[PDB]
Design a protein around this ligand. Structure first.
Ligand SMILES: [Mg+2]
Ligand SMILES: [Mg+2]
Lengths: 716, 13, 716, 14
């Protein structure tokens, strides 16, 4: 059976004087001190919770078996999607179990690879490459490393011919690319201001993002300033250069929304080519009404992807010399989301459509916009189309729940109809034919039909006897695709599991209407959709309440935490990874202020009223005190986080853990809460980008805990 | 890429 | 501290009626039934011992930490020694953690490799290649796979140009190579007769080995018979073809000795090819007086390595047209063993000498025999010289306790003096400079000096406080060299260990006199040498009796078992891997009759009298019943074996385990034997050639058990 | 020799 050994919950101090007023409503915050990650009391908290977590995980006798089977199932070589610059080709490679992927160069696609940068030689591959950019002549490689424990990036540059490093060093980058000019003299990039003397990446909320240009062979202090806006500190940036080299495009965003400005700088009409300097941008779009991504241009005639009067998106054309005259090229599909578009083979387009959460590729003529070929893809995901307009061969990656990884090739000149296999990964000692994945539509609370994928062994009896894992996200217009996971295969084969992915509202799967039906005032719909999916898996006979585990990350951690507060009776195991748990204060820390488009903000009264109803730390309640449900407790709960997660600050997880342990366990002398409530806190790690063995260790602990919580035996 | 979301991952674990 | 939980030893049936007479001496064999591996009672025994082993290994809390550190330390790429055929080059490769090595082809040494055979794509790499042979034109690759669970081999053939398989299939091979004729039409090989309908590789003693020739494009039934000897069923075979293609050489051996016949077949004087057919061999040597290996020939003038009147070996020359006139070319060294010789660069020789258990390479002129250059090698091992007479570049492999693997290159024309690094393996995150290896010469019981290597952290105090692992073999003329082991590095760094390798008698290290001083009537010398090495490590202050572990495999498993029967007081942990434990009956099973050269045989009265004094299963005795040593027990003992080990049948291990558990534990109502006596039985595996992760799992269990037995804590 | 009570292209130097 499950957990029997008694639990020594550690003491956690409460400061009872901390109370905040939100428009007349008082809210106590007695774990306010856990907001400081560098204090002695917080470091002691982490030590005590590690100790508790270790004694619980010692009781989970299947961790070692999961660990070895994950290692075995992921031990296959993985070739990344290749891209071209000049007459060289470039790709990422991993021989199967390397700590981080290696970046390689070739003369032709079937030639000997040469290693350009191997992260495994630095600090055991604790961190990998988060930025990688090759110049137009293929002579230089700009690469982004992690100098500290946070996700902040330092940019270095090397010569491809001998791998010698230049001395250039650029600090203060997060998500920016490095965008080379066709003269090969430098690149655009978009940094934040420097840290001042006292400051720390874990406690500073960075603002005032900049657009800069760096000349090769200079100090970062000489980089040219192109754009800043001190009167709108929260406005953030992305950028791009056109395939012909003529135009630098700056996109300006506000919050999480899919709505951006478009500023264009004509590089061919500068008197002193960027040393002249804000710059004289043509402001094509100067408001936050719609999304705009440049796909191609011939001179000043541009082709954009846009959601303007088009919730499922479309392609449109406009001349910069006549800026107010926009014309449709490929109209909005009546059914399906246009996810992305790419110019190829000089005068053609590849369009990626999402049709009931499956991809469909269309080949089209660029000038006229007419359909040429249509290729439906199997259940899974196509992504990573990086080919540029000058290339006649297009590459992309395919993954699915039961398909580890294929790199496909579409030669547009020689045979544009079908797809050929360039590379194909294989899972060792795994018979794919014994399992199946199906889509079903389940009615939510309000009647809306929610698509879900269900993966399972073929021919099982729907008798309620199977352990079930359900995954979801539901936010920011993100499309949740059934991709490959090695640990999920171990769950299916060796624990007899049923896996479910729920395409709940708040994602982008049916366009902008799907996103808006699960954000701001309608965030509760997201939780209702997830709860309804779990109720369907029970009523149809896949599983029962004791045997359901739910998991999710970040906005998906919020999902898990809210669902266990509202319907603890439905679940046997809950795993929240790096979740947003204090919805009253999230906007104050690091770049959390960028989530106010989706969540709203407690600075405003009507938005506070949404947030207080579901904020995880403000809604923990003893389920046994509600008349009728005296035999209900919280499921076995694992809260996961990392000590230098600057994306989602670990105070979110720390404060929830303390509130749960207090309300349910330590505030009562003889609690009915038997199931364990623990945290697994990864030391010296950030949100993402961890070494292979470090991530395997986290995942094996999660699944061992799950198996114990659900009372699921191992199957050889 | 700037959202409450975890996505050149070393392995599909 | 160490083992505290009592063990629930399972019941094991005794058949008290089984008694054998050996020249008037009665020997009871009450576990005779464990000689059948396919019976239900034997399968139950295995199940019960697995269960007992699991509960003991659950108490050993360092197994998981050892397992992860072994995986991490062995995760580096390994390039094999390349060899040449026509204008192609061939080698084995492993990217670090692949289950089995992959065989690759190249056009040039720095060109792109092409995979010819990948064992990892068949049954998860359960088994690898045990035979690999490329034809003279480089167009065909003959390769040996394991179709069952034993080590028996099936030979298949593929075309190198497209990797298409030929239909040809050859069964019934063990250790034979595949030796191609220069016409590219076929190859010589030396199989055993087929299994009959009832028979099983685990219970049949194969005899009547044959020399055959296989034509490409025919069934195995058509293969030409060249040699068989029905009146000497035990005589076994090796074979070779000369560099010029002229002569097929058949070597005939009797038992394990280093003494062989030499039969020569002139291929250029056959009327009708090999289809003419025993064959008309010239019987150059027709007795078992000495060892003879052909190194080179010019027409009928041959150059042999031999131990004839030369226990340290030498090179000699003879003309087949005048067969009785032998002349020395390189005389026997007064000090050092000539281990091997190789013809290179048309008119030169590389000679490999062993000088106090360190290799020395000499370059010599072939015709005159005169010394040209001399290259001393560091502590470690050079081997794998496969270059042929026509090659001007020689490759070989170097390994040491602290050096994972270098492939060296010696260009004889351009610069014959020094060695260049072709490939060099590196252990990730391991500082080599913190450790050292030293050789010391220790007196045995009779005065003979025994070389031992001692590996340890630099600057440790000789205060008796360190855990110590000692390894040895001592048999069959085998030279034990200090090679690289990843698990041994974990022992040194993370358990603060001292490793010792003892070059005891019965090996070949000081020539044939060293072998003969530890075989047949003098086998006890081998055990005495090992015991004296452990006594030196104690008296000099490296360790003490509680803190010494001993390990060995096969003939080395015998070593361990005999030493614990005779001096149980010296050791804290004993690990015997696939050991020969019934010295009265070993000759009856599979190819165990080939060990009678070294051991003698119980069919003969004086030889039985040697064997009964040390046979492990016949010499288990309660040490506490001898007056004076009432506080002595057997050390914590792990007996390792595999269920399809057809080399050393697992009945050896099963019978010892049962005898030890009976005599020391279950035959007494309140035994002083507290230390555990268990078996770790690997399911679905043979003697050797197991997948990387399967072997890592065995080795992590061994070391976790050792750490517990010796009371050694982990060091971060 | 290959045929002895002996354990020796091993996949890895474990
Ligand atoms: Mg810090
Ligand atoms: Mg069998």
């Amino acid at each position: 059976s499950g957990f029997s050994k008694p639990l020594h919950y550690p003491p956690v101090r409460r400061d009872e004087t901390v109370v905040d007023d939100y428009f007349g409503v008082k809210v106590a915050d007695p774990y306010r001190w856990l907001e400081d990650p560098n204090s002695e009391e917080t470091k002691e908290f982490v030590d005590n919770q590690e100790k508790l977590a270790n004694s619980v995980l010692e009781e989970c006798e299947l961790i070692d078996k999961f660990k070895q089977k994950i290692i075995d199932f992921v031990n296959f070589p993985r070739c990344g999607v290749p891209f071209r610059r000049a007459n060289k080709y470039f790709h990422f490679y991993n021989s199967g179990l390397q700590a981080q992927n290696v970046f390689q160069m070739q003369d032709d696609l079937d030639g000997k690879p040469e290693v350009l940068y191997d992260p495994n030689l630095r600090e055991g591959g604790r961190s990998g490459l988060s930025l990688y950019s090759v110049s137009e002549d293929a002579k230089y490689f700009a690469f982004g490393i992690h100098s500290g424990l946070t996700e902040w990036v330092t940019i270095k540059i090397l010569k491809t011919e001998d791998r010698s490093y230049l001395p250039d060093t650029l600090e203060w980058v997060k998500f920016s690319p490095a965008i080379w000019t066709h003269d090969n003299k430098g690149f655009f990039y978009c940094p934040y201001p420097p840290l001042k003397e006292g400051e720390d990446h874990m406690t500073r909320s960075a603002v005032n993002q900049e657009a800069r240009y760096h000349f090769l062979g200079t100090d970062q202090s000489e980089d040219i300033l192109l754009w800043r806006d001190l009167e709108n500190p929260a406005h953030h940036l992305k950028c791009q250069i056109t395939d012909d080299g003529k135009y630098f495009l700056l996109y300006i965003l506000d919050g999480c929304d899919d709505a951006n400005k478009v500023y264009c700088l004509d590089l061919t009409k500068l008197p002193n080519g960027l040393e002249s300097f804000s710059a004289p941008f043509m402001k094509l779009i100067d408001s936050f009404d719609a999304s705009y991504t440049a796909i191609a241009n011939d001179g000043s005639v541009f082709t954009f992807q846009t959601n303007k009067d088009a919730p499922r998106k479309k392609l449109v054309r406009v001349d910069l010399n006549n800026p107010s005259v926009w014309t449709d090229l490929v109209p909005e599909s009546k059914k399906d989301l246009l996810e992305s578009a790419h110019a190829v083979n000089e005068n053609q387009l590849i369009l990626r459509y999402l049709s009931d959460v499956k991809h469909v590729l269309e080949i089209r003529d660029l000038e006229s916009g007419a359909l040429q070929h249509r290729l439906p893809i199997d259940i899974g995901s196509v992504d990573g189309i990086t080919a540029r307009r000058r290339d006649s061969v297009v590459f992309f990656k395919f993954t699915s729940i039961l398909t580890p990884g294929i790199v496909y090739q579409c030669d547009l000149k020689n045979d544009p109809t079908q797809l050929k296999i360039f590379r194909e990964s294989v899972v060792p000692d795994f018979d794919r034919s014994e399992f199946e994945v199906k889509q079903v539509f389940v009615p939510s609370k309000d009647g809306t039909k929610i698509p879900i994928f269900i993966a399972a062994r073929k021919g099982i009896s729907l008798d309620g006897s199977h352990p079930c894992e359900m995954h979801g996200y539901g936010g920011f217009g993100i499309n949740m695709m059934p991709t490959f996971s090695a640990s999920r295969i171990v769950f299916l084969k060796h624990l007899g599991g049923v896996f479910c992915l729920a395409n709940i509202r708040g994602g982008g799967e049916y366009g902008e209407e799907w996103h808006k039906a699960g954000f701001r005032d309608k965030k509760q719909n997201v939780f209702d959709d997830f709860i309804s999916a779990a109720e369907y898996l029970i009523s149809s006979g896949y599983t029962k309440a004791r045997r359901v585990a739910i998991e999710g990350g970040a906005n998906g951690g919020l999902l898990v935490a809210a669902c266990i507060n509202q319907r603890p009776d439905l679940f046997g195991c809950a795993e929240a990874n790096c979740g947003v748990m204090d919805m009253l204060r999230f906007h104050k820390f690091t770049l959390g202020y960028l989530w106010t488009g989706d969540y709203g903000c407690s600075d405003k009264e009507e938005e506070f009223k949404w947030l207080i109803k579901y904020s995880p730390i403000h809604n923990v309640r003893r389920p046994w005190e509600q008349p009728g449900n005296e035999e209900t407790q919280y499921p076995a709960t694992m809260i996961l986080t990392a000590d230098h997660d600057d994306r989602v600050v670990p105070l979110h997880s720390f404060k929830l853990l303390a509130t749960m342990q207090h309300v349910l366990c330590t505030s009562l002398e003889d609690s009915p809460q038997k199931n364990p409530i623990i945290a697994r806190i990864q030391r010296k790690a950030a949100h993402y980008g961890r070494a292979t063995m470090t991530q395997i260790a986290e995942v094996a602990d999660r699944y061992g805990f799950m198996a114990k919580a659900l009372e699921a035996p191992w199957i050889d | 890429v700037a959202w409450a979301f975890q996505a050149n991952a070393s392995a599909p674990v």
